[PDB]
C-alpha cells in the first residue's frame, strides 16, 4: 500500500521528515544494542532492569520434556467431561460418583481454585496440591493418584 504509505504524502518537503539540522545519516548511536554499559545506561536501566549478569545454577543439556507438568484448575475440572454426566450424577441418583481422569485430557497436576460444587467426584491425576485435595474432601469426593 504505497498509496496509503506516508512517503507518498511527504514529497515536496526538503528533509523528508527527518529535520534539516539533525540529518539522519547512517547510524548515530551505534548498531543494535551498542553502549549497554557506556552511554545508553539510562535506557537499559530504567527500561530493562536486570539485563546484565548471571543469577542461577548452570544446567547443561536441559530438556523441556522431563519437567512437563501442565496445570488444570477446579473451575475447568468439570468441563473435561461432558455436562450430561454431571447432570445425571447430580440428579440425586445414589451415593455413586463419576470418575474424571485429567490425564486423558492431557493435564498432569490439579491445582486448587474456588467454586467447586457440592456434587462428589473422583479425580485421578499424577500430582495434587493440598488446596485441591482439601476442596475435594470438603465437597465429599476423594483424591486418587495414578502412575
Amino acid at each position: 500500500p504505497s498509496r496509503l504509505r506516508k512517503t507518498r504524502k511527504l514529497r515536496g518537503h526538503v528533509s523528508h521528515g527527518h529535520g534539516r539540522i539533525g540529518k539522519h545519516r547512517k547510524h548515530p548511536g551505534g548498531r543494535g544494542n551498542a553502549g549497554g554499559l557506556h552511554h545508553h545506561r539510562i535506557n537499559f536501566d530504567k527500561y530493562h532492569p536486570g539485563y546484565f549478569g548471571k543469577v542461577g545454577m548452570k544446567h547443561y543439556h536441559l530438556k523441556r520434556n522431563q519437567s512437563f507438568c501442565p496445570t488444570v484448575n477446579l473451575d475447568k475440572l468439570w468441563t473435561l467431561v461432558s455436562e450430561q454426566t454431571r447432570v445425571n450424577a447430580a440428579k440425586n441418583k445414589t451415593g455413586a460418583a463419576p470418575i474424571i481422569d485429567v490425564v486423558r485430557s492431557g493435564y498432569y497436576k490439579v491445582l486448587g481454585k474456588g467454586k467447586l460444587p457440592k456434587q462428589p467426584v473422583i479425580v485421578k491425576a499424577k500430582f495434587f496440591s493440598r488446596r485441591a485435595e482439601e476442596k475435594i474432601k470438603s465437597v465429599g469426593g476423594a483424591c486418587v493418584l495414578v502412575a
Binding site: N33, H40, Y47, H48, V103
Partner: protein, 103 residues
C-alpha cells in the same frame, strides 16, 4: 539506537543471509510431483495396498507422551516368532521386521 519502552532485539541477520535464501515457490509443483509419485506407485505395484507394510502399536518414550500411542516401525522379532512365521517371509508378506526392538 534504542528508544522508549521497547523489547531488546537480537535478530540473527549479521551473517550475509540474502545470498543463501532457499524459497518455497516450487511447493505446489512438489505437491503435484508427490501426488503423481503416489499414483504411479499405486499403478506400479499390483493388488498390494498403498502404504503396504503394516505397522505396530507403540507407546512414546517421555514422561510427556507416554499416555499416547504411535504407529511404530516393526514387529520386534520375539513378537514375530510368537506369530509363528519366519523372518524374511514376513517382509514378503508385508509384515514389517525391525530386529532392534525389545519387548
Amino acid at each position: 539506537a534504542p528508544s522508549r519502552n521497547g523489547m531488546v532485539l537480537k535478530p540473527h541477520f549479521h551473517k550475509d543471509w540474502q545470498r543463501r535464501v532457499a524459497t518455497w515457490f516450487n511447493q505446489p509443483a512438489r505437491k503435484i510431483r508427490r501426488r503423481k509419485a503416489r499414483q504411479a506407485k499405486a499403478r506400479r505395484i499390483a493388488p498390494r495396498p498403498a502404504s503396504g507394510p503394516i505397522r505396530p502399536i507403540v507407546r512414546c518414550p517421555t514422561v510427556r507422551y507416554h499416555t499416547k500411542v504411535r504407529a511404530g516401525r516393526g514387529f520386534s522379532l520375539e513378537e514375530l516368532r510368537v506369530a509363528g512365521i519366519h523372518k524374511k517371509v514376513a517382509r514378503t508378506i508385508g509384515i514389517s521386521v525391525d530386529p532392534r526392538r525389545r519387548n
